Amino acid sequence: GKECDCSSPENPCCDAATCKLRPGAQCGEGLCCEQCKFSRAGKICRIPRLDMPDDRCTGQSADCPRYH
């Protein structure tokens, strides 16, 4: 139940007072979230350098986690 769906003290999609958003977009901040909306699936959110599967967003996630 995180009431903070964003972390920007100067964002329109999200109010810092309640660190939440206005029921118009999907997120206020995040790597897999652009235009206050989530990024499509397969969204590269991290790229190391060795030989491995680049980190891509599930398309429904707003930020990018860390697995593997």
Curated annotation (Swiss-Prot):
Residue positions of motif Cell attachment site: 49-51
Disulfides per UniProt: 4-19, 6-14, 13-36, 27-33, 32-57, 45-64
Domain Disintegrin: 1-68
Superkingdom in the source lineage: Eukaryota
Record's function text: Inhibits platelet aggregation induced by ADP, thrombin, platelet-activating factor and collagen. Acts by inhibiting fibrinogen interaction with platelet receptors alpha-IIb/beta-3 (ITGA2B/ITGB3).
Protein name, UniProt field: Disintegrin rhodostomin
Source organism of this protein record: Calloselasma rhodostoma
Interval of the full protein contained in this chain: 408 to 475 of 478
